[PDB]
Coordinates of C-alpha atoms in Angstrom, one line a residue:
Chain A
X1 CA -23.7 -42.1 52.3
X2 CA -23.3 -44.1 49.1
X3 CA -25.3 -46.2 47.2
X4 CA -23.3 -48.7 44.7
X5 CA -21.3 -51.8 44.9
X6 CA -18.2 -51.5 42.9
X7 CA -14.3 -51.3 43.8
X8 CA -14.7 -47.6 44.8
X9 CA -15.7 -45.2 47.8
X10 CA -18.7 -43.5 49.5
X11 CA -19.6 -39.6 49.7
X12 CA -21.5 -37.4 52.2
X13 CA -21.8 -34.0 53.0
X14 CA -23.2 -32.5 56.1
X15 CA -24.0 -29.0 57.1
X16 CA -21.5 -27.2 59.8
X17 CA -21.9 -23.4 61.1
X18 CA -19.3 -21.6 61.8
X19 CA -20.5 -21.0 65.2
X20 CA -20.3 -25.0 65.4
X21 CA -17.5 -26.6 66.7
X22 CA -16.4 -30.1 66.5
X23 CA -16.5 -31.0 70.0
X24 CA -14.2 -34.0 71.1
X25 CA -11.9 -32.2 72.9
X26 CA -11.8 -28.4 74.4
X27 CA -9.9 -25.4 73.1
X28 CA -10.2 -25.3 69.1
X29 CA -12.5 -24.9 66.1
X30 CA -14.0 -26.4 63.2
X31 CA -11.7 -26.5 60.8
X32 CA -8.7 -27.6 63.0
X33 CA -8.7 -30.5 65.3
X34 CA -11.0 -32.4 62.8
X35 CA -8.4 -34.4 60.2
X36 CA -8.1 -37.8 61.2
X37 CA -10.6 -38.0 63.9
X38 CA -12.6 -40.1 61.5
X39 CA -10.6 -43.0 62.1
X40 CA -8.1 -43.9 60.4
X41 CA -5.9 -40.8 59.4
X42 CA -7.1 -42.1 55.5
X43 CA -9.9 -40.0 54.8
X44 CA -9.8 -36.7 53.5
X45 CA -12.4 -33.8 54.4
X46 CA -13.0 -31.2 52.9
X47 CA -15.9 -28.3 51.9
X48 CA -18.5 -27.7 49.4
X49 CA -17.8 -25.3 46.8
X50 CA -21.1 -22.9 46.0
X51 CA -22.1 -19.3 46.9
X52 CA -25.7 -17.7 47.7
X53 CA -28.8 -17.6 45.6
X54 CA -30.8 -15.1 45.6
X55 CA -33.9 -15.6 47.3
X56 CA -37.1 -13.5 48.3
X57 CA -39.4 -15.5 51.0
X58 CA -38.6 -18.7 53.5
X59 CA -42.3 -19.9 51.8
X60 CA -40.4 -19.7 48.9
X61 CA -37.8 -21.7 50.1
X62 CA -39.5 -24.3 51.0
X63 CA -41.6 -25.0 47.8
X64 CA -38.4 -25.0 45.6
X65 CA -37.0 -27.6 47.9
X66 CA -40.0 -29.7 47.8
X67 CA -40.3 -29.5 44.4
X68 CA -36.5 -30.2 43.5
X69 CA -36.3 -33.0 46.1
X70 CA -38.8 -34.6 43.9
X71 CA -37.3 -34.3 40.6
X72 CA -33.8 -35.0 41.9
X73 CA -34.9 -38.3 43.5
X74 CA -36.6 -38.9 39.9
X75 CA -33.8 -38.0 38.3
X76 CA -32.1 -40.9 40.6
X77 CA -34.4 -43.6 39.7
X78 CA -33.6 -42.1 35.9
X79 CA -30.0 -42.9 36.5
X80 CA -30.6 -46.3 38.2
X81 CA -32.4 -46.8 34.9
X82 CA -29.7 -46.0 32.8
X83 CA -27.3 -48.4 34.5
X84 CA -29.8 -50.6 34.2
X85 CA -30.1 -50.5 30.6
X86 CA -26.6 -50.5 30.1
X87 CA -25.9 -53.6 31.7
X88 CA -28.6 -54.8 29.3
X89 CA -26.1 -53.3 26.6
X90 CA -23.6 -55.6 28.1
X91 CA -20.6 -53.5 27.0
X92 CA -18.7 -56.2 29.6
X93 CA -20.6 -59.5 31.3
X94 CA -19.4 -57.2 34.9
X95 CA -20.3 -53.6 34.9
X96 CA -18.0 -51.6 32.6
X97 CA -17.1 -47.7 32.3
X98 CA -17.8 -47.5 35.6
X99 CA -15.1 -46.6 38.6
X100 CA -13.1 -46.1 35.7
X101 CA -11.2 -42.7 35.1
X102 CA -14.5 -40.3 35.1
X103 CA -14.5 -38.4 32.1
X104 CA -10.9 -40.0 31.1
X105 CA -10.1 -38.7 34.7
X106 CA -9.4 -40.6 37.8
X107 CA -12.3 -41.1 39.5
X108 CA -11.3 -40.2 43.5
X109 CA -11.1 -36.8 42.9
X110 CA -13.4 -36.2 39.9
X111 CA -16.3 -35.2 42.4
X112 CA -14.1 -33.3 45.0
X113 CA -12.5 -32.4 41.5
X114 CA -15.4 -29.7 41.9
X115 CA -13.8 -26.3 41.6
X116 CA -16.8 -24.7 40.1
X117 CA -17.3 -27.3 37.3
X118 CA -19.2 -24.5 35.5
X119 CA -21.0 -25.7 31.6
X120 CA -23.8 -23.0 32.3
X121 CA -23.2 -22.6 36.1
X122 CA -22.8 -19.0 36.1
X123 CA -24.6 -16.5 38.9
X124 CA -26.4 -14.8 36.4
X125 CA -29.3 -17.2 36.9
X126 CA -31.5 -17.2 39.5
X127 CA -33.5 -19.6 42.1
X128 CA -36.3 -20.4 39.7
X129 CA -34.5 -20.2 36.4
X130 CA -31.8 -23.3 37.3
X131 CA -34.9 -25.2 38.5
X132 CA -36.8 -25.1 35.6
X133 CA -33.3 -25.2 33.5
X134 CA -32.3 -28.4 35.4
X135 CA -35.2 -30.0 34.8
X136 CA -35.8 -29.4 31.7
X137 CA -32.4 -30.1 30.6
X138 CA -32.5 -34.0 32.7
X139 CA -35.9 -34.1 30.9
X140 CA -34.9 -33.7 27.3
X141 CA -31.3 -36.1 28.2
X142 CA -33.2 -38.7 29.6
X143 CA -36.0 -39.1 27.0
X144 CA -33.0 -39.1 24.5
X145 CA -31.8 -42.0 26.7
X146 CA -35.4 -43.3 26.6
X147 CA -35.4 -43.5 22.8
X148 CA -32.4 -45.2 22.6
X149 CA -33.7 -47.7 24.8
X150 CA -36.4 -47.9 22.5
X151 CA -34.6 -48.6 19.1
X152 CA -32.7 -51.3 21.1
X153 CA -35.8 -53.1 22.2
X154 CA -37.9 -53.5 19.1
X155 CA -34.3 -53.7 17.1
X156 CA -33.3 -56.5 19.7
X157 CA -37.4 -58.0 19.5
X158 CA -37.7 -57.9 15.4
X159 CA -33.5 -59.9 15.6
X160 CA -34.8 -62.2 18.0
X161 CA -37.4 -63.1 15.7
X162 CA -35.4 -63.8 12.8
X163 CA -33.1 -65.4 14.6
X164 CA -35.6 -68.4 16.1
X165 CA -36.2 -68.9 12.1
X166 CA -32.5 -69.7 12.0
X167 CA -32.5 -71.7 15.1
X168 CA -34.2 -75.1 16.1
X169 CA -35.2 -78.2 14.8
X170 CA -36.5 -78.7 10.9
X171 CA -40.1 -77.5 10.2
X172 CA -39.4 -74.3 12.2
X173 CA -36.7 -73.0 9.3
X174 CA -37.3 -71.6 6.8
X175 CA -36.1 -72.8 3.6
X176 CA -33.6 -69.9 1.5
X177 CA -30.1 -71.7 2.0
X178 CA -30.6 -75.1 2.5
X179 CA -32.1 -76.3 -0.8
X180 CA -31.2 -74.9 -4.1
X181 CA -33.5 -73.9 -6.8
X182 CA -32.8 -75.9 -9.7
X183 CA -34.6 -79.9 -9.1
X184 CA -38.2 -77.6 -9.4
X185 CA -38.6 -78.5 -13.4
X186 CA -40.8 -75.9 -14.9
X187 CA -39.8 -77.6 -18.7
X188 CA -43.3 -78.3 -18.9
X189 CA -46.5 -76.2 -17.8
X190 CA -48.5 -79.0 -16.7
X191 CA -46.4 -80.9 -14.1
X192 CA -46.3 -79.2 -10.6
X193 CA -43.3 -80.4 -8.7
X194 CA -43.5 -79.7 -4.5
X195 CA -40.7 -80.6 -2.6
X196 CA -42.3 -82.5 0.6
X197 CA -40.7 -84.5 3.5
X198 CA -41.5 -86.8 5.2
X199 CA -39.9 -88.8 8.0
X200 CA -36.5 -91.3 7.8
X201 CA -38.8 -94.1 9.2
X202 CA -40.4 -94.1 5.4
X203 CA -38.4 -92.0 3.3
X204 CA -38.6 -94.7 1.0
X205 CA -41.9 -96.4 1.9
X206 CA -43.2 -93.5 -0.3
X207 CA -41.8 -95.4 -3.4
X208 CA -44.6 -98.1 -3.6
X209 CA -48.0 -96.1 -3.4
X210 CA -46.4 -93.0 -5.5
X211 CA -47.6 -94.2 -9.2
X212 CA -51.6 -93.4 -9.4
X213 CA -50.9 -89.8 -10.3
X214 CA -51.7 -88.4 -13.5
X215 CA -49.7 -88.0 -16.8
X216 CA -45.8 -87.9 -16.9
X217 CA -45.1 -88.4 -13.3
X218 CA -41.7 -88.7 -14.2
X219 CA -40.0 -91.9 -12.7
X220 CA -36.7 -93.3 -11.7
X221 CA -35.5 -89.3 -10.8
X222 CA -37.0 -88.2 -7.4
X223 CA -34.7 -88.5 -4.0
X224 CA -33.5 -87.0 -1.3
X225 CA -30.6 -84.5 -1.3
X226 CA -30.6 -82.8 1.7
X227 CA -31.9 -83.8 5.7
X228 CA -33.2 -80.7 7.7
X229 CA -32.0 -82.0 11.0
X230 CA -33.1 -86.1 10.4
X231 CA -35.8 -86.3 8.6
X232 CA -36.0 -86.3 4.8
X233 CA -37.1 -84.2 1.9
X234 CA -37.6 -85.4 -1.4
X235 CA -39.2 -84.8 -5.2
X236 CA -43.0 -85.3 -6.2
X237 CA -44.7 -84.7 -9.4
X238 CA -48.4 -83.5 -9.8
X239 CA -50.4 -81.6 -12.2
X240 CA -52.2 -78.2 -11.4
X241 CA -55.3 -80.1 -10.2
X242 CA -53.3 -82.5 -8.4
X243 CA -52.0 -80.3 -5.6
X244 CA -54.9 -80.8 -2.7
X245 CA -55.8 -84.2 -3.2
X246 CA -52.0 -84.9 -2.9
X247 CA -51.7 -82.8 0.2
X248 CA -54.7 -84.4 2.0
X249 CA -53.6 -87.9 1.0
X250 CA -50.2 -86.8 2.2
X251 CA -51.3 -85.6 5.6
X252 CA -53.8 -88.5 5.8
X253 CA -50.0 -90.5 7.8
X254 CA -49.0 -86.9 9.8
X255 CA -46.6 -85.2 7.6
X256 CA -46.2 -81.4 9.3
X257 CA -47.9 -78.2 7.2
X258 CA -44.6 -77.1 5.9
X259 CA -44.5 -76.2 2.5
X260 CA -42.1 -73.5 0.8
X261 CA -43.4 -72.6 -2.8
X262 CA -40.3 -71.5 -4.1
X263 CA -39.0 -68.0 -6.3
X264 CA -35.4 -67.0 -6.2
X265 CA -36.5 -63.6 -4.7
X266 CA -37.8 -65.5 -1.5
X267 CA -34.4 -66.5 -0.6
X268 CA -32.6 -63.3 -1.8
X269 CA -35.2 -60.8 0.7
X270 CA -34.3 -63.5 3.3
X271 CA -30.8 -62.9 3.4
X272 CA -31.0 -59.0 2.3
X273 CA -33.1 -58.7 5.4
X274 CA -31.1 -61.1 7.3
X275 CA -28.1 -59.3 7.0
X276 CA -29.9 -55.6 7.2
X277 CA -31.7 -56.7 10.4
X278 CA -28.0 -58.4 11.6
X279 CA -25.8 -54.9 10.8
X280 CA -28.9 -52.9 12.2
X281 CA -28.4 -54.0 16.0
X282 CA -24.5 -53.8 15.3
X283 CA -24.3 -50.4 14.4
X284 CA -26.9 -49.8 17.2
X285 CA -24.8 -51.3 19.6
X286 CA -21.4 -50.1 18.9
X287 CA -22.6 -46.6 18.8
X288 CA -25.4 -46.4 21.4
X289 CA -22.4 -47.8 24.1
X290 CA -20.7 -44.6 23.5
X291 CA -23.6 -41.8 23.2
X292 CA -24.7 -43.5 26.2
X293 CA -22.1 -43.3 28.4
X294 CA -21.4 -39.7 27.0
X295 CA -24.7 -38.2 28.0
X296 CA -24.0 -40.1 31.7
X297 CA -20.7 -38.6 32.4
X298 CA -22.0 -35.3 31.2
X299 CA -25.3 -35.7 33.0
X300 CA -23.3 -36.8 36.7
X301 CA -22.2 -33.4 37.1
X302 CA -25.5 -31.6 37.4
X303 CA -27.1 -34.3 39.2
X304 CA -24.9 -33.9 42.0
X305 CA -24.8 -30.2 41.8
X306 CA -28.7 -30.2 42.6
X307 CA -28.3 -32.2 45.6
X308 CA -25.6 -29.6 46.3
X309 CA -27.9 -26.6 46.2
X310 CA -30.2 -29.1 48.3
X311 CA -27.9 -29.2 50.8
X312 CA -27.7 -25.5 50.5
X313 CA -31.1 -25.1 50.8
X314 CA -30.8 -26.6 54.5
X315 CA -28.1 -24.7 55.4
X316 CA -29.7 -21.1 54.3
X317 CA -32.5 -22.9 56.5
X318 CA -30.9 -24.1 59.5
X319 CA -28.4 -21.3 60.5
X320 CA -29.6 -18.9 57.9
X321 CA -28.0 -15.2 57.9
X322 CA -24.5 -16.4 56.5
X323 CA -25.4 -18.6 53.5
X324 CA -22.7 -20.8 53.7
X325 CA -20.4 -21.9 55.8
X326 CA -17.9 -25.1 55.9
X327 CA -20.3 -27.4 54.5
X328 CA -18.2 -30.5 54.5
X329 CA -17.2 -33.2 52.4
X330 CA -15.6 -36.1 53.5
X331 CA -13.8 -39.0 51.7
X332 CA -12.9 -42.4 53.2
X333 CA -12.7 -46.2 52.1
X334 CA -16.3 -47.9 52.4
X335 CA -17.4 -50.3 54.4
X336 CA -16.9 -48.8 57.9
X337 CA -19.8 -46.3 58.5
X338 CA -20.5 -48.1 61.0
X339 CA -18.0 -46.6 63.8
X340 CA -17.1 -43.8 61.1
X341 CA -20.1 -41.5 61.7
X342 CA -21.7 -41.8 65.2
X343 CA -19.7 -40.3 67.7
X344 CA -18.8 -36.9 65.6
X345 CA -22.7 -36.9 64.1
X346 CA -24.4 -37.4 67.4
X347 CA -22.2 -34.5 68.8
X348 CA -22.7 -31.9 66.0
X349 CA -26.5 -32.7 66.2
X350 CA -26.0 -32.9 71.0
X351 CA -24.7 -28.8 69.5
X352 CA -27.4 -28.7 67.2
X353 CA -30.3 -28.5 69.8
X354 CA -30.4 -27.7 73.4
X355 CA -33.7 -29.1 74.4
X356 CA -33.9 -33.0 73.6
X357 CA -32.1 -36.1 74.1
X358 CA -33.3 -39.5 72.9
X359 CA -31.8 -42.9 71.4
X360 CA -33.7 -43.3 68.2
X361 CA -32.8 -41.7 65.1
X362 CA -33.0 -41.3 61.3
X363 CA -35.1 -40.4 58.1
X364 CA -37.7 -43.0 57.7
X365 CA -41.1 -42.5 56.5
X366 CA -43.7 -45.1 57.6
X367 CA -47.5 -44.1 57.2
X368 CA -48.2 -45.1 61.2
X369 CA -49.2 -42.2 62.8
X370 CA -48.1 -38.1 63.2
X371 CA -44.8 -40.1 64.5
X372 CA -42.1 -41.3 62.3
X373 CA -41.5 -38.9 59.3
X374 CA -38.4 -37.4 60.1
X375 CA -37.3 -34.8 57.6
X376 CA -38.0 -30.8 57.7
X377 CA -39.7 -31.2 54.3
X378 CA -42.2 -33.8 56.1
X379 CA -42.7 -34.3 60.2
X380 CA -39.8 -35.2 62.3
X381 CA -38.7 -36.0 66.3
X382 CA -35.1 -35.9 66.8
X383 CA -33.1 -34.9 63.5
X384 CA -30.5 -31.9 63.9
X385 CA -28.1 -31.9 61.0
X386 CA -28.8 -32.5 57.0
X387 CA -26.4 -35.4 55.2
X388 CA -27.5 -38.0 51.8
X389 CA -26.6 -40.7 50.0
X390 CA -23.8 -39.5 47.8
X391 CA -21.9 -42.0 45.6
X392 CA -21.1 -41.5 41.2
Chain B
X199 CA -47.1 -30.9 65.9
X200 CA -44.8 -29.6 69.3
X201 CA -41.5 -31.2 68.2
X202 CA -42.7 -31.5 64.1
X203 CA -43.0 -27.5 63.8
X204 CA -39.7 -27.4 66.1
X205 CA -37.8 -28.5 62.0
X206 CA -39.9 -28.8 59.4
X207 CA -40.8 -24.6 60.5
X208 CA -37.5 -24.3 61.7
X209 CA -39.0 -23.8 65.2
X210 CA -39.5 -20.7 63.5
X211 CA -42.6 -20.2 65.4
X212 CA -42.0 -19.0 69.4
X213 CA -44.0 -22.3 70.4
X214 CA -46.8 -21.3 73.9
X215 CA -49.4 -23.9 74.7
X216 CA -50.5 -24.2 78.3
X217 CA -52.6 -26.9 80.2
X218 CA -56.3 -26.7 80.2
X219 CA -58.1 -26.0 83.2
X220 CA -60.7 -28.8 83.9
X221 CA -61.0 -30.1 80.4
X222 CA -64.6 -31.2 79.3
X223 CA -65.9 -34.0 76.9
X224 CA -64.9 -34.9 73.7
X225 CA -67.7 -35.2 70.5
X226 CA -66.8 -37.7 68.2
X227 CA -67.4 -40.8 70.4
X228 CA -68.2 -38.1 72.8
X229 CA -65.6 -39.5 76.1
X230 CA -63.6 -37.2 78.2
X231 CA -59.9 -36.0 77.2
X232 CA -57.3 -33.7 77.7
X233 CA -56.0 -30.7 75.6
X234 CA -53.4 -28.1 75.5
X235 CA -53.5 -24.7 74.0
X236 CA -51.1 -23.4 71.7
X237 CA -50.5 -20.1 70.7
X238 CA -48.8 -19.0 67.2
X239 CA -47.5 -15.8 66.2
X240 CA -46.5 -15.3 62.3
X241 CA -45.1 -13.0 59.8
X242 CA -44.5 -15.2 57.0
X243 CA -48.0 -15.9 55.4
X244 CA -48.2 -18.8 53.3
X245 CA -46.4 -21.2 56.4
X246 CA -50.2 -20.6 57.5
X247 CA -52.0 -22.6 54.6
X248 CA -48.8 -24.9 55.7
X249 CA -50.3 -24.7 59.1
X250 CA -54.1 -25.6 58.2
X251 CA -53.4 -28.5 55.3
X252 CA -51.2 -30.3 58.4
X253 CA -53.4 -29.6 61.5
X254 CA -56.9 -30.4 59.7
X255 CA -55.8 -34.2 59.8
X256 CA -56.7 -33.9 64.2
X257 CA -58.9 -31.0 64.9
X258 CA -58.6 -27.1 63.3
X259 CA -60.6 -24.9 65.6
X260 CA -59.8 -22.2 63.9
X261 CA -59.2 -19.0 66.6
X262 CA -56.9 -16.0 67.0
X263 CA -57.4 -12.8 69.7
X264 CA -57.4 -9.6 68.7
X265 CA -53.8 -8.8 69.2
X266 CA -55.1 -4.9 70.2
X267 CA -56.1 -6.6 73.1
X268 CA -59.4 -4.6 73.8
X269 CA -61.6 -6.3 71.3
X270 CA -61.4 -8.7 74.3
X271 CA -64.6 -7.0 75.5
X272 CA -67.3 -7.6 72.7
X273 CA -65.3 -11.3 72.0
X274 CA -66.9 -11.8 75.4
X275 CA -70.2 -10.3 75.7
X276 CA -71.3 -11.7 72.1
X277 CA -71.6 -14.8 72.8
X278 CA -71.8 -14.6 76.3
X279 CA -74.9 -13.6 75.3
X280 CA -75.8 -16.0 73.6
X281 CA -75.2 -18.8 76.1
X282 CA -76.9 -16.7 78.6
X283 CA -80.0 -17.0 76.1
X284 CA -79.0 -21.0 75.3
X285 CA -79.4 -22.1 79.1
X286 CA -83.4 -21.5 78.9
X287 CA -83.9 -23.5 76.2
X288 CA -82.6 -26.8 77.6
X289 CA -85.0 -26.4 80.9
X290 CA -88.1 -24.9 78.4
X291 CA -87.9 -28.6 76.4
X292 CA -87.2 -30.9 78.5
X293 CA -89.9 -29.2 81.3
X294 CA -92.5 -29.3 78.4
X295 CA -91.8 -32.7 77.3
X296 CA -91.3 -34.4 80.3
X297 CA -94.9 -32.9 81.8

């Protein structure tokens, strides 16, 4: 069946003999009398593309299915990842790239576009070297992917952290372009000049108990030029053993900690880093989006092809001495498995055995008892043919 | 195991198991109980460690005649044998202890 939710279709395949027939009404064959019996006459059905592999022992068999089952459903939850993190990426606020022409291509056919998609598909190989080549191969891609998911996240965690220093209230800043540098005097080598705020309620309360300093606390010049959000921020005087005291007596009415000693350079690493950190994640962005998506498109095509061999693997199983046979696609609108599937699937499995007839069927594992497994990889009760979920 | 091997081996196995004639006591709560007996032919080889790791879960007695079916003989006599020589022991013990 399928798995997504999107404005496109859902996929199966299903394993057919040839000495199967598609039994609804007497006097034909399979490939005949089946093309619009799934209801409708809108689908389109069609076969599997994908001779023999060589093989030496049934025990074999069966350990290179286990053991590709299990990287192909990892291999799933890798994709399901990737999705994931490209929403995150958030190329569009809905899901983007996506149903779109696969590979530039329209997307309907672009799976039963399979007429040997070959990149290193080639006979040559044999059982065990694709395994190990597959896997290896979704390995390396996905741990690419991994490490791009990476950059993003301590990229994204070190931008959000500049970026609360440029947002919320005053005394969470931090001071490179709201103030400017010249009201510090350093004309004289005594006086020490810090820049503290206090709140509007006294802003100029602090103009009566200001005068017990020591020498040359210049009058008649201090003031407030700027106001964070609405408090104030003003001019003191005091000299180099007058910094301390001040603060304590200061504090001694609950002024916040907050004071920015100032040098030019301060401000000018601010914004270089600012603006480094800011062109960083765009870059990152912009060109992760399209590496991303690259390595998906690229990657769909094996991904499905090992669930092909899968199938394969059950057919060279269940009916054995010809390899393959018409090992069916099929193609209709979603939505309707529902009375799509029953009647024709409980028929080719009613051919499929000649000993047992109950109501309950499926695939299920639940840990209960030697009942309810249902596969040939793992126990089963009543399960003739082989189909998955296939969607992109 | 009847329907399971049926798949999962294909059915690959020519499945025989009969019904037990007057079945006898169970040992792990020790009750009575019922049993069939299924017989397995192979020529694939590791499907038998398949065999073992599934059917240990229940009970693996593990057993097999001599397919040359003459070793039939001594399978019988040595250890008929024996439970010709275990039936004394039972009556020596408990007449001992119970006098």
């Amino acid at each position: 069946m399928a798995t997504a939710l999107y404005t496109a279709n859902d996929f199966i395949l299903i394993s057919l003999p040839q000495n199967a027939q598609p039994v609804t009404a007497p006097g034909s064959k399979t490939d005949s009398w089946f093309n619009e019996t799934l209801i409708g006459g809108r689908a389109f059905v069609s076969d599997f593309k994908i001779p023999e592999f060589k093989i030496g022992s049934l025990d074999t068999l069966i350990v290179e299915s286990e053991e590709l089952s299990k990287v192909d459903n990892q291999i799933g939850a890798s994709i399901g990842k990737i999705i994931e993190i490209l929403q995150g990426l958030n190329e569009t606020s809905t899901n983007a790239y996506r149903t779109l022409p696969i590979n530039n291509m329209p997307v309907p056919e672009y799976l039963e576009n399979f007429q040997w998609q070959t990149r290193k598909f080639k006979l040559d190989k044999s059982i065990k070297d694709l395994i190990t080549l597959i896997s290896n191969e979704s390995s390396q891609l996905d741990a690419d992917v991994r490490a791009t998911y990476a950059n993003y996240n301590s990229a994204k965690t070190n931008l959000a952290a500049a970026e609360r220093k440029k947002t919320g209230d005053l005394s969470v800043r931090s001071l490179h372009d709201i103030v400017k540098p010249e009201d510090f005097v350093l004309n004289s080598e005594h006086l020490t000049t810090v820049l503290v705020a206090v709140p509007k309620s006294l802003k100029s309360d602090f103009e009566k108990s200001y005068e017990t300093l020591s020498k040359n606390v210049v009058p008649a010049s201090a003031s407030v030029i700027a106001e964070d959000a609405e408090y104030v921020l003003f001019n003191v005087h005091l000299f180099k053993k007058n910094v301390q005291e001040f603060t304590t007596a200061a504090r001694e009415k609950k002024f916040i900690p907050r004071e920015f000693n100032y040098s030019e350079e301060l401000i000018d690493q601010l914004k270089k880093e600012h603006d480094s950190a800011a062109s960083l994640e765009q870059s990152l962005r912009v060109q992760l989006v399209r590496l991303a998506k690259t390595a998906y498109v690229d990657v769909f095509i094996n991904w499905f092809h090992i669930k092909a061999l899968r199938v394969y693997v059950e057919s060279v199983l269940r009916y054995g001495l010809p390899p393959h046979f018409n090992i069916k696609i099929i193609a209709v609108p979603p939505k309707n498995l529902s009375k799509c599937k029953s009647e024709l699937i409980d028929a080719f499995g009613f051919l499929g055995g000649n000993a047992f007839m109950k109501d309950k069927k499926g695939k299920i594992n639940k840990q209960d008892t030697s009942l309810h497994q249902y596969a040939s990889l793992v126990d089963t009760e009543y399960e003739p043919f082989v189909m998955y979920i296939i969607n992109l | 195991l009847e329907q399971i091997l049926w798949r999962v081996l294909r059915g690959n196995l020519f499945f025989k198991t009969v019904e037990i004639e007057q079945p006898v006591y169970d040992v792990k709560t020790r009750e009575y109980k019922h049993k069939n007996a299924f017989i397995v032919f192979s020529h694939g080889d590791l499907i038998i460690k398949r065999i073992r790791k599934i059917a240990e879960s229940l009970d693996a007695n593990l057993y097999d005649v001599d397919s040359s079916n003459e070793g039939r003989s001594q399978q019988l006599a040595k250890v008929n044998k024996n439970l010709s020589d275990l039936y004394t022991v039972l009556k020596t013990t408990s007449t001992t202890l119970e006098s």
